[PDB]
Design a protein around this ligand. Structure first.
Ligand SMILES: CC(C)c1noc(=O)[nH]1
Ligand SMILES: [Mn+2]
Ligand SMILES: [Mn+2]
Lengths: 137, 137
């Protein structure tokens, strides 16, 4: 069977600013870089940044809702979000429709999120405040 | 500090075929569904399918290299690839890297991959045969 996410690969238009964003600003661990990419980890996540001449810097109104959320503790969430805000990181969403989340953009407009809580916790919250038509299995 | 990938959210144009693809074809566990989305799990991965009228069914030549790889064992790889082939699922790339990989498209053109092997395995291979310009940290 399939057992989870092996890796996330993001196409990037400029490798150095993207490496700096994920490593310096978001605090991910940089393991290797080469002329056309980089490998980082975020806990158990394997992140690949791949230099792609096809990647465009995409405003959030032009892309769909596909997005990548990273886990952060309740204790660290607000100060990390505020630090991104103070650093000028662009946002893409404000309404918290799926719990405690901060929605921000990477240098190419990849839609990112800081989120506090697991799937189990989200399902429990949804039982009390369900999305319209929601059914649980 | 970020501790991992919290969830992956894919924008989908039609919820029913996307649920069928991820749950029935790919074998992921469906935990909940509502009028505009679904929550599934695949090992530790929390996957959200979000119904989005802005999602275009996107040919692979028209999207960048951003992609999502799922883990599978070497022993299970060939039969899973054959399942996708029997189902007529399109391939967007041939494998030319270390570790088995099958590159396939979801119903909306999201670029997916089955991959065998960890970041540690990839780094070990790269240390022996570094990519052009490769530096390790
Ligand atoms: C760019 C290449 C070395 C790669 N590594 O992981 C990927 O998904 N692509
Ligand atoms: Mn989210
Ligand atoms: Mn890959």
């Amino acid at each position: 069977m399939l057992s989870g996410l092996n890796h996330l690969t993001l196409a990037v238009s400029q490798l150095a600013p993207s490496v700096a964003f994920y490593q310096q600003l978001l605090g991910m661990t940089l393991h290797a870089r080469w002329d056309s990419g980089a490998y980082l980890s975020c806990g158990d996540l394997w992140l690949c940044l791949s230099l792609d001449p096809q990647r465009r810097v995409t405003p959030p109104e032009e892309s769909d809702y596909t997005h990548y959320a990273f886990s952060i503790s309740e204790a660290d969430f607000a100060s990390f979000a505020a630090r991104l805000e103070a650093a000028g990181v662009a946002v893409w969403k404000l309404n918290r429709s799926e719990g405690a989340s901060h929605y921000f953009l990477d240098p190419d407009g990849h839609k990112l999120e800081l989120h506090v809580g697991s799937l189990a916790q989200r399902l429990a919250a949804c039982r009390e405040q369900p999305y319209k038509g929601m059914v649980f299995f």
